[PDB]
Amino acid sequence: SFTPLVVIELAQDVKEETKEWLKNRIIAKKKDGGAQLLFRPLLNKYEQETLENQNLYLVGASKIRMLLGAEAVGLVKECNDNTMRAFTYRTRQNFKGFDDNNDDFLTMAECQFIIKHELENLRAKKMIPGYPQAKLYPGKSLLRRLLTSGIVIQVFPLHDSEALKKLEDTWYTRFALKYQPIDSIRGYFGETIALYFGFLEYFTFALIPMAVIGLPYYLFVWEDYDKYVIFASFNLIWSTVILELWKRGCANMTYRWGTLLMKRKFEEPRPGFHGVLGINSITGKEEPLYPSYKRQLRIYLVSLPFVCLCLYFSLYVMMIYFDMEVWALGLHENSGSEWTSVLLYVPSIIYAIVIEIMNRLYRYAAEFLTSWENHRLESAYQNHLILKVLVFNFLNCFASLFYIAFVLKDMKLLRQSLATLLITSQILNQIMESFLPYWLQRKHGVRDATLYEQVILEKEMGTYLGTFDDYLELFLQFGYVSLFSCVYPLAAAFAVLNNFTEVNSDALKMCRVFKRPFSEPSANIGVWQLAFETMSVISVVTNCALIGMSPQVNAVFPESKADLILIVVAVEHALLALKFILAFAIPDKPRHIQMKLARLEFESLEALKQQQMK
Amino acid sequence: SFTPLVVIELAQDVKEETKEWLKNRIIAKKKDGGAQLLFRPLLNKYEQETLENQNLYLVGASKIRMLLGAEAVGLVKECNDNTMRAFTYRTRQNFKGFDDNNDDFLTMAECQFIIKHELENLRAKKMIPGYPQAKLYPGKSLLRRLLTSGIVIQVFPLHDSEALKKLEDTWYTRFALKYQPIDSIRGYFGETIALYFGFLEYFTFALIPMAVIGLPYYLFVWEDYDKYVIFASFNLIWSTVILELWKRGCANMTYRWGTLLMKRKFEEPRPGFHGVLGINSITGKEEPLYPSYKRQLRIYLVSLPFVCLCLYFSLYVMMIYFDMEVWALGLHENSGSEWTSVLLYVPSIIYAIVIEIMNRLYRYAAEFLTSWENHRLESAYQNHLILKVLVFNFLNCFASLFYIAFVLKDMKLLRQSLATLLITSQILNQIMESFLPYWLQRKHGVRDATLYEQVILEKEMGTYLGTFDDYLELFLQFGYVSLFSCVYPLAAAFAVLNNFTEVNSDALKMCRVFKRPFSEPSANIGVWQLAFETMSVISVVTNCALIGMSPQVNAVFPESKADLILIVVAVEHALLALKFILAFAIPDKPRHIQMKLARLEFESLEALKQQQMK
């Protein structure tokens, strides 16, 4: 009679012995090598209608069990003295907002995170009973072998239809401007989804000065007087400021949530690293082992030539597009003027569609090529995949702008091509990401019952595939903003007016489109902070090269273009030095957050002294 | 009847009440707020001859006390399973090389470090008894108020004349080439002095390829064929390799010694930060407080203009030297050729003496200006002093080479001036640092008795003022090597042949010149790693600017010097990127050291799981 939080769906062809052994490995207590979780079928009785739903199981626990599970996970909650400490059952009266009659203290996400962590840390100590090919060993996780061998079909947490609606009431900003409730988003969806929406809320409120400056700069032709130099330098400094204020805002949020203080959990091998069984050198346990030189050979002799081949084909399609552009320019030169200006925006649109096709095609190819190299952890696997996808997306997005700026050197054609590329890529992004899937979701949607209808609905819901495309879009948004801020700053507003929909659209995507994602703790954006800083470092060189190519600055040095290049290279190195000087001088965390972390450190040092003295 | 390790010399005008209270605060046990150290006068009886030595006291302890003090300090020793763990008395049988009859387990340096740490962590819980002006408060260290108020004259550890000689037998490499015993140096002098000698042993074995290549490059005129491009690029890559291999070698040494695993101790306020007494916000104790904005005002409005004024006077003396150089060149143009070539090396020698005067003059000025800003810790105070001294020493050493290379652009005069500046600075360094003081030390030296003679000798010995000048010399050695490796690579051998004496000379300086230094733990060189990396980053730009100025490469692009500058700036940014790519790709610690640290981390995680399960 408990409250269901997570639904586990087994497969169809699962024998009874594996079912009873798993149920005996689920219901048994934590000291007997079980998990001491409340277990239930989807229906206590069954008829001929629900026989195809006989593998859905409900998992809960009791409050002291969940509190002990919060102790086992290592949740960092606030104490009564406004300090974020780890949760322990012996010191449980010290924490802020804790009563003995409060069922709203640990949220359902943390409980589902704890239940996922208790299902994840449930290892078996030679085969799965009932299945021959399910190769097990002592020290192997049960959930990994049940997921990979096709016994457990899906494990999904449950949406709360009365707390999602009270979130949806404050999420859809259909009336006017409104601060997004990132903390309630956090309390319902974990910290990783909130970090994506927090980075998006930060990136929305960091292109607003760019949009506000660039709004009279585009209608009124004020591109003549400052010539995009003040705003681009301001943008790049603001990007450095925002990449520190994102770090500041992430420190503010993750101190307010506690994930600034959560320790680095030791990472299990990722689902799909297979080798031969042996003794792990680091941990001393038994694990599959793969030689690192074979993996490094499979990377640095197979993956890198494949990435280079895809880069060469992207450059070849880029050169094909420029031959088509010159032919269309000749076709515009041939026929006329009235109907031959709109035809010039078509091949860049066609190239953008081919870019958005090649990006998805490369995404399948990079996923296959990185799941084949047998990476051990998931962070390293994610980093290599992020590296491959970032390289291809940078190249596919900025090759035409680099070819326009540094080979053709034609700012009028650069203004036309940058505006056409940015708006069409943004429109195709908004069409292929959410708008065409929302109509299909509306079409698919048009096509104890409160749980079974929900479980049937969440069986066929979509899974959340991480915040990677949503950061890649922001990376490409940051690419469209900072790379070509010189010829067309108004496009930044066309990004913000996209993100002002995307903030709605992703919210709808979290509300009526997907299943409930599993809660994942994250203290920062990860390598995306480095990627945005690398973008902000590349944009320094790009902004200075756009400074160092105008006819206004070249009018200062009309005859000697060898001192202009030297001064520009000196300014570029000075800008690189000032960016690095700003990055080394500004501390990441503020003073009082550092003082609070120092107090938490000093308390541990005083705890060590008391533990030494006894 | 104990063994004396550290001698404390009180002042003359010290009343008996302060003496008896300190002796009662020394002899009393650790639970009664004392230190439980064996205390002794220098002489149990006194005659009229030794009445002026009545303030010398001997401090020791017993073995279990020293083991408990090693537990209290947190020494990291090797276990029986070849693992470096912290020393505890309950697990004391686990550690490598430990018997119950071994007096050679804890060295005298660690015992003196423990005795210094026990004298340092001995706080009083309103005035010093007998002295009115000695302003005390509960929570204030006794040794700091006894040192600053002139009651304790000096506290010095004792040299071991039979282990220094067995060190001196293996230190003076008077016969031939020999690996310096850095571990025995470590076991006698602590890890900081060994880290200086380890960095010097590394820097000696990293200029040997530079010297070996540059030795036939100078006698046989092979400067024509490669023109210093291969060796300088190799040197800068080697400097990056050596700044990683210093990190590798420091990781190897500090894992072999244990200081890679020692935790960061919380830093007390430095001796000389005075404010008003109040509640410390971080620790919660009672401390003197100073407002940070007043300190930041005293820095950024007084110190930085003073540094700028000293930099302007250094530039003015540099410009004065160049006017003297042009006048002397005209004087060489006037008189003749035979006696007018040696006169050209005199003003650079005079400028070098003025540089070595201005560096010492700036050192007094920077010490005064940084002890006046009331810095709280000693690391921040040392970092600001290191920042000021590095800026002035970089400017005073490389201004003439930058003015020769990028303003006069005369490589023949650059070769002559760089060779003359390097050799004269090295000769004046070897004269003013050790050679003239060794003769004066020989002169001063020519001018239970085994302890009293030693204590009288160590009363008048010199104190070791840290490894700062000895790193500044290496920084200037690295400056003379990597900044002007193009016009004169043979000077690197003249550095190595200096360091081959300096390795002897500093050893003599540690053997027959100074008092025994207090043992100081250090895990790295500190900010000097960043300084050498910043030097290795600056030397990238300098080597490429020396590549981009020769007539050999300019013969490739005779007419278009605007594409040469663009290619050189692209090569410079590529070299900066490759240096940063090499710095981000190469891990600091090796694999097995990381595995051993991971095992020590995994053992703590397993300890946490067992502490959670009970």
mmCIF file of C-alpha atoms in Angstrom, chain A residues 275-539:
data_model
loop_
_atom_site.group_PDB
_atom_site.id
_atom_site.type_symbol
_atom_site.label_atom_id
_atom_site.label_comp_id
_atom_site.label_asym_id
_atom_site.label_seq_id
_atom_site.Cartn_x
_atom_site.Cartn_y
_atom_site.Cartn_z
ATOM 1 C CA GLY A 275 36.888 -7.328 -22.468
ATOM 2 C CA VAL A 276 38.156 -10.478 -20.813
ATOM 3 C CA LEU A 277 37.464 -11.132 -17.139
ATOM 4 C CA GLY A 278 40.400 -10.421 -14.850
ATOM 5 C CA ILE A 279 41.566 -8.594 -11.756
ATOM 6 C CA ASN A 280 41.178 -4.826 -11.870
ATOM 7 C CA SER A 281 44.465 -3.195 -10.928
ATOM 8 C CA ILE A 282 42.983 -0.056 -9.356
ATOM 9 C CA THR A 283 40.114 -1.467 -7.328
ATOM 10 C CA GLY A 284 41.310 -5.037 -6.849
ATOM 11 C CA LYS A 285 37.920 -6.456 -7.810
ATOM 12 C CA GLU A 286 37.079 -8.694 -10.770
ATOM 13 C CA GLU A 287 36.210 -6.856 -13.967
ATOM 14 C CA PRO A 288 36.372 -7.279 -17.741
ATOM 15 C CA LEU A 289 39.715 -5.985 -18.970
ATOM 16 C CA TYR A 290 40.695 -4.508 -22.323
ATOM 17 C CA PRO A 291 44.257 -3.487 -23.229
ATOM 18 C CA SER A 292 44.594 0.271 -23.487
ATOM 19 C CA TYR A 293 46.938 0.145 -26.474
ATOM 20 C CA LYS A 294 44.347 -1.742 -28.516
ATOM 21 C CA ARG A 295 41.812 0.941 -27.626
ATOM 22 C CA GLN A 296 44.343 3.664 -28.422
ATOM 23 C CA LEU A 297 45.078 1.923 -31.712
ATOM 24 C CA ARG A 298 41.355 1.710 -32.429
ATOM 25 C CA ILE A 299 41.114 5.430 -31.675
ATOM 26 C CA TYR A 300 44.244 6.915 -33.188
ATOM 27 C CA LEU A 301 44.264 4.715 -36.303
ATOM 28 C CA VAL A 302 40.552 4.179 -37.066
ATOM 29 C CA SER A 303 38.542 6.970 -35.444
ATOM 30 C CA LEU A 304 40.803 9.907 -36.332
ATOM 31 C CA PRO A 305 41.047 8.878 -40.040
ATOM 32 C CA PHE A 306 37.265 8.493 -40.028
ATOM 33 C CA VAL A 307 36.893 11.947 -38.488
ATOM 34 C CA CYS A 308 39.344 13.286 -41.062
ATOM 35 C CA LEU A 309 37.420 11.606 -43.885
ATOM 36 C CA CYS A 310 34.187 13.165 -42.651
ATOM 37 C CA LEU A 311 35.933 16.526 -42.329
ATOM 38 C CA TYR A 312 37.253 16.223 -45.883
ATOM 39 C CA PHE A 313 33.776 15.437 -47.197
ATOM 40 C CA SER A 314 32.386 18.398 -45.265
ATOM 41 C CA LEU A 315 35.051 20.628 -46.798
ATOM 42 C CA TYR A 316 34.263 19.129 -50.197
ATOM 43 C CA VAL A 317 30.554 19.827 -49.758
ATOM 44 C CA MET A 318 31.532 23.330 -48.650
ATOM 45 C CA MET A 319 33.559 23.796 -51.834
ATOM 46 C CA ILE A 320 30.678 22.317 -53.829
ATOM 47 C CA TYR A 321 28.388 24.876 -52.199
ATOM 48 C CA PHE A 322 30.719 27.724 -53.167
ATOM 49 C CA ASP A 323 30.817 26.556 -56.778
ATOM 50 C CA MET A 324 27.022 26.480 -56.658
ATOM 51 C CA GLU A 325 27.061 29.946 -55.084
ATOM 52 C CA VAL A 326 29.296 31.374 -57.820
ATOM 53 C CA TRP A 327 27.110 29.720 -60.465
ATOM 54 C CA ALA A 328 24.022 31.194 -58.802
ATOM 55 C CA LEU A 329 25.765 34.567 -58.603
ATOM 56 C CA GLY A 330 26.419 34.233 -62.318
ATOM 57 C CA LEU A 331 22.786 33.195 -62.715
ATOM 58 C CA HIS A 332 21.854 36.312 -60.740
ATOM 59 C CA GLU A 333 24.185 38.225 -63.059
ATOM 60 C CA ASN A 334 22.443 36.656 -66.059
ATOM 61 C CA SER A 335 18.691 36.897 -65.622
ATOM 62 C CA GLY A 336 17.674 39.980 -63.679
ATOM 63 C CA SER A 337 17.414 41.742 -60.339
ATOM 64 C CA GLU A 338 13.902 41.400 -58.870
ATOM 65 C CA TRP A 339 13.524 37.625 -58.806
ATOM 66 C CA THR A 340 17.290 36.964 -58.699
ATOM 67 C CA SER A 341 17.928 38.229 -55.168
ATOM 68 C CA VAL A 342 15.731 35.707 -53.385
ATOM 69 C CA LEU A 343 17.328 32.878 -55.362
ATOM 70 C CA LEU A 344 20.655 33.778 -53.732
ATOM 71 C CA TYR A 345 19.344 32.768 -50.312
ATOM 72 C CA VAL A 346 18.239 29.329 -51.507
ATOM 73 C CA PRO A 347 21.643 27.522 -51.781
ATOM 74 C CA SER A 348 22.683 28.675 -48.325
ATOM 75 C CA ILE A 349 19.367 27.308 -47.076
ATOM 76 C CA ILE A 350 20.041 24.090 -48.995
ATOM 77 C CA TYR A 351 23.539 23.995 -47.496
ATOM 78 C CA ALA A 352 22.022 24.514 -44.054
ATOM 79 C CA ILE A 353 19.650 21.591 -44.581
ATOM 80 C CA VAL A 354 22.587 19.504 -45.763
ATOM 81 C CA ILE A 355 24.504 20.671 -42.683
ATOM 82 C CA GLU A 356 21.624 19.638 -40.434
ATOM 83 C CA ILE A 357 21.535 16.335 -42.302
ATOM 84 C CA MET A 358 25.293 15.811 -42.090
ATOM 85 C CA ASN A 359 25.288 16.658 -38.377
ATOM 86 C CA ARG A 360 22.719 13.953 -37.693
ATOM 87 C CA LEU A 361 24.522 11.546 -40.024
ATOM 88 C CA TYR A 362 27.809 12.246 -38.246
ATOM 89 C CA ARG A 363 26.026 11.808 -34.913
ATOM 90 C CA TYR A 364 25.107 8.226 -35.790
ATOM 91 C CA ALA A 365 28.616 7.625 -37.136
ATOM 92 C CA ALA A 366 30.295 9.104 -34.071
ATOM 93 C CA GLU A 367 28.039 7.185 -31.684
ATOM 94 C CA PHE A 368 28.933 3.963 -33.474
ATOM 95 C CA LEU A 369 32.632 4.802 -33.636
ATOM 96 C CA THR A 370 32.804 5.728 -29.968
ATOM 97 C CA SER A 371 30.748 2.797 -28.719
ATOM 98 C CA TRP A 372 33.143 0.598 -30.665
ATOM 99 C CA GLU A 373 36.370 1.774 -29.010
ATOM 100 C CA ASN A 374 35.324 0.169 -25.658
ATOM 101 C CA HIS A 375 35.708 3.210 -23.426
ATOM 102 C CA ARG A 376 35.686 2.324 -19.749
ATOM 103 C CA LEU A 377 33.841 5.113 -17.956
ATOM 104 C CA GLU A 378 30.919 7.105 -19.281
ATOM 105 C CA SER A 379 32.575 10.494 -18.720
ATOM 106 C CA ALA A 380 35.518 9.610 -20.957
ATOM 107 C CA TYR A 381 33.135 8.135 -23.508
ATOM 108 C CA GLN A 382 31.001 11.275 -23.324
ATOM 109 C CA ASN A 383 34.094 13.503 -23.589
ATOM 110 C CA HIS A 384 35.368 11.772 -26.718
ATOM 111 C CA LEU A 385 31.901 11.896 -28.263
ATOM 112 C CA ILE A 386 31.649 15.557 -27.267
ATOM 113 C CA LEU A 387 35.085 16.156 -28.807
ATOM 114 C CA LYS A 388 34.139 14.504 -32.100
ATOM 115 C CA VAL A 389 30.754 16.239 -32.331
ATOM 116 C CA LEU A 390 32.148 19.652 -31.343
ATOM 117 C CA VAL A 391 34.881 19.442 -33.971
ATOM 118 C CA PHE A 392 32.438 18.497 -36.715
ATOM 119 C CA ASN A 393 29.847 21.065 -35.647
ATOM 120 C CA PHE A 394 32.411 23.878 -35.427
ATOM 121 C CA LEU A 395 33.722 22.950 -38.863
ATOM 122 C CA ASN A 396 30.303 22.525 -40.454
ATOM 123 C CA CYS A 397 29.019 25.806 -39.027
ATOM 124 C CA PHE A 398 31.986 28.167 -39.358
ATOM 125 C CA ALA A 399 33.757 27.025 -42.542
ATOM 126 C CA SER A 400 31.695 29.271 -44.806
ATOM 127 C CA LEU A 401 32.138 32.234 -42.484
ATOM 128 C CA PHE A 402 35.885 31.671 -42.349
ATOM 129 C CA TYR A 403 35.970 31.297 -46.140
ATOM 130 C CA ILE A 404 33.964 34.493 -46.583
ATOM 131 C CA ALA A 405 35.980 36.518 -44.090
ATOM 132 C CA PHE A 406 39.511 35.413 -44.920
ATOM 133 C CA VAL A 407 39.426 34.274 -48.564
ATOM 134 C CA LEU A 408 36.776 36.217 -50.467
ATOM 135 C CA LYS A 409 36.987 39.220 -48.069
ATOM 136 C CA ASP A 410 33.600 40.646 -49.090
ATOM 137 C CA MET A 411 31.658 42.105 -46.184
ATOM 138 C CA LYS A 412 28.474 42.785 -48.159
ATOM 139 C CA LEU A 413 28.267 39.144 -49.239
ATOM 140 C CA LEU A 414 29.359 38.245 -45.706
ATOM 141 C CA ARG A 415 26.460 40.215 -44.203
ATOM 142 C CA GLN A 416 23.962 38.575 -46.556
ATOM 143 C CA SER A 417 25.348 35.049 -46.099
ATOM 144 C CA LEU A 418 25.714 35.288 -42.305
ATOM 145 C CA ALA A 419 22.167 36.564 -41.839
ATOM 146 C CA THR A 420 20.782 33.919 -44.183
ATOM 147 C CA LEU A 421 22.809 31.104 -42.596
ATOM 148 C CA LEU A 422 21.948 32.104 -39.011
ATOM 149 C CA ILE A 423 18.203 32.564 -39.542
ATOM 150 C CA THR A 424 17.787 29.423 -41.644
ATOM 151 C CA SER A 425 19.824 27.327 -39.211
ATOM 152 C CA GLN A 426 17.776 28.715 -36.334
ATOM 153 C CA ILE A 427 14.506 28.080 -38.166
ATOM 154 C CA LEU A 428 15.570 24.561 -39.135
ATOM 155 C CA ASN A 429 16.765 23.981 -35.574
ATOM 156 C CA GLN A 430 13.396 25.060 -34.201
ATOM 157 C CA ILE A 431 11.596 22.977 -36.820
ATOM 158 C CA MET A 432 13.530 19.717 -36.583
ATOM 159 C CA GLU A 433 14.057 19.785 -32.818
ATOM 160 C CA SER A 434 10.667 20.547 -31.307
ATOM 161 C CA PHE A 435 8.032 21.991 -33.669
ATOM 162 C CA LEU A 436 7.641 19.109 -36.114
ATOM 163 C CA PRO A 437 7.978 16.596 -33.199
ATOM 164 C CA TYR A 438 5.356 18.517 -31.160
ATOM 165 C CA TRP A 439 2.800 18.171 -33.945
ATOM 166 C CA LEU A 440 3.686 14.484 -34.228
ATOM 167 C CA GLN A 441 3.439 14.280 -30.442
ATOM 168 C CA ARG A 442 0.062 16.008 -30.688
ATOM 169 C CA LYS A 443 -0.878 13.539 -33.432
ATOM 170 C CA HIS A 444 0.339 10.586 -31.346
ATOM 171 C CA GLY A 445 -1.409 12.046 -28.303
ATOM 172 C CA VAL A 446 -4.705 12.499 -30.152
ATOM 173 C CA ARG A 447 -4.337 8.908 -31.391
ATOM 174 C CA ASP A 448 -6.324 1.995 -10.128
ATOM 175 C CA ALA A 449 -6.519 3.714 -13.484
ATOM 176 C CA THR A 450 -4.420 6.746 -12.491
ATOM 177 C CA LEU A 451 -1.284 4.569 -12.472
ATOM 178 C CA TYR A 452 -2.028 2.022 -15.223
ATOM 179 C CA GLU A 453 -3.039 4.709 -17.747
ATOM 180 C CA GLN A 454 0.086 6.623 -16.723
ATOM 181 C CA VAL A 455 2.306 3.541 -16.952
ATOM 182 C CA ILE A 456 0.842 2.714 -20.357
ATOM 183 C CA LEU A 457 1.444 6.347 -21.301
ATOM 184 C CA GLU A 458 4.951 6.326 -19.885
ATOM 185 C CA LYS A 459 5.708 2.999 -21.553
ATOM 186 C CA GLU A 460 5.375 4.753 -24.898
ATOM 187 C CA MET A 461 6.817 8.077 -23.814
ATOM 188 C CA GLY A 462 10.177 9.270 -25.089
ATOM 189 C CA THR A 463 13.352 9.023 -23.079
ATOM 190 C CA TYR A 464 15.507 12.061 -22.415
ATOM 191 C CA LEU A 465 18.809 11.623 -24.210
ATOM 192 C CA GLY A 466 20.792 13.971 -21.974
ATOM 193 C CA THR A 467 21.561 17.667 -22.307
ATOM 194 C CA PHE A 468 23.907 17.298 -25.256
ATOM 195 C CA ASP A 469 21.964 18.482 -28.298
ATOM 196 C CA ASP A 470 20.506 21.270 -26.180
ATOM 197 C CA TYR A 471 24.020 22.351 -25.334
ATOM 198 C CA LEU A 472 25.177 21.847 -28.911
ATOM 199 C CA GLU A 473 22.412 24.189 -30.035
ATOM 200 C CA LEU A 474 23.580 26.714 -27.456
ATOM 201 C CA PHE A 475 27.139 26.162 -28.644
ATOM 202 C CA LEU A 476 25.999 26.820 -32.193
ATOM 203 C CA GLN A 477 23.975 29.747 -30.871
ATOM 204 C CA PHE A 478 27.161 31.005 -29.251
ATOM 205 C CA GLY A 479 28.868 30.252 -32.544
ATOM 206 C CA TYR A 480 26.374 32.268 -34.580
ATOM 207 C CA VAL A 481 26.535 35.097 -32.066
ATOM 208 C CA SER A 482 30.211 35.569 -31.422
ATOM 209 C CA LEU A 483 31.821 34.492 -34.701
ATOM 210 C CA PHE A 484 29.896 36.917 -36.921
ATOM 211 C CA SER A 485 28.899 39.636 -34.495
ATOM 212 C CA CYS A 486 30.518 42.148 -36.839
ATOM 213 C CA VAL A 487 28.385 41.985 -40.015
ATOM 214 C CA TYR A 488 25.036 41.285 -38.382
ATOM 215 C CA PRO A 489 24.471 41.783 -34.645
ATOM 216 C CA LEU A 490 20.663 41.709 -35.043
ATOM 217 C CA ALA A 491 20.848 37.890 -35.400
ATOM 218 C CA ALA A 492 21.539 37.678 -31.659
ATOM 219 C CA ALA A 493 17.986 38.896 -31.083
ATOM 220 C CA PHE A 494 16.877 36.209 -33.545
ATOM 221 C CA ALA A 495 18.661 33.757 -31.255
ATOM 222 C CA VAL A 496 17.044 35.201 -28.152
ATOM 223 C CA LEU A 497 13.617 35.167 -29.799
ATOM 224 C CA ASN A 498 14.397 31.533 -30.565
ATOM 225 C CA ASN A 499 15.458 30.804 -27.005
ATOM 226 C CA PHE A 500 12.386 32.664 -25.712
ATOM 227 C CA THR A 501 10.451 29.984 -27.562
ATOM 228 C CA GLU A 502 12.907 27.225 -26.672
ATOM 229 C CA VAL A 503 12.456 27.978 -22.959
ATOM 230 C CA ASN A 504 8.759 27.372 -23.588
ATOM 231 C CA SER A 505 9.258 24.510 -26.032
ATOM 232 C CA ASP A 506 11.681 22.436 -23.943
ATOM 233 C CA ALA A 507 9.350 23.027 -20.988
ATOM 234 C CA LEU A 508 6.536 21.553 -23.084
ATOM 235 C CA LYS A 509 9.014 18.835 -24.077
ATOM 236 C CA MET A 510 9.478 18.057 -20.390
ATOM 237 C CA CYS A 511 5.753 18.274 -19.640
ATOM 238 C CA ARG A 512 3.815 16.550 -22.411
ATOM 239 C CA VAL A 513 6.489 14.808 -24.484
ATOM 240 C CA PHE A 514 8.927 12.728 -22.487
ATOM 241 C CA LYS A 515 9.004 10.206 -19.685
ATOM 242 C CA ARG A 516 10.287 11.308 -16.290
ATOM 243 C CA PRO A 517 14.107 11.359 -16.468
ATOM 244 C CA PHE A 518 16.180 9.810 -13.727
ATOM 245 C CA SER A 519 17.673 12.402 -11.375
ATOM 246 C CA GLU A 520 21.358 13.000 -12.054
ATOM 247 C CA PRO A 521 23.626 15.106 -9.810
ATOM 248 C CA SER A 522 25.954 17.551 -11.538
ATOM 249 C CA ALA A 523 28.125 20.264 -10.019
ATOM 250 C CA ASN A 524 28.971 22.097 -13.253
ATOM 251 C CA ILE A 525 28.324 21.851 -16.974
ATOM 252 C CA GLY A 526 31.504 19.804 -17.158
ATOM 253 C CA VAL A 527 33.651 20.087 -20.241
ATOM 254 C CA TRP A 528 31.090 22.464 -21.713
ATOM 255 C CA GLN A 529 32.551 25.213 -19.541
ATOM 256 C CA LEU A 530 35.859 24.590 -21.278
ATOM 257 C CA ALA A 531 34.087 24.438 -24.631
ATOM 258 C CA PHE A 532 32.403 27.783 -24.086
ATOM 259 C CA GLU A 533 35.700 29.217 -22.864
ATOM 260 C CA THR A 534 37.439 27.767 -25.908
ATOM 261 C CA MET A 535 34.727 29.336 -28.032
ATOM 262 C CA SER A 536 35.249 32.588 -26.140
ATOM 263 C CA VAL A 537 38.966 32.240 -26.804
ATOM 264 C CA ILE A 538 38.467 31.474 -30.485
ATOM 265 C CA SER A 539 36.031 34.391 -30.715
#
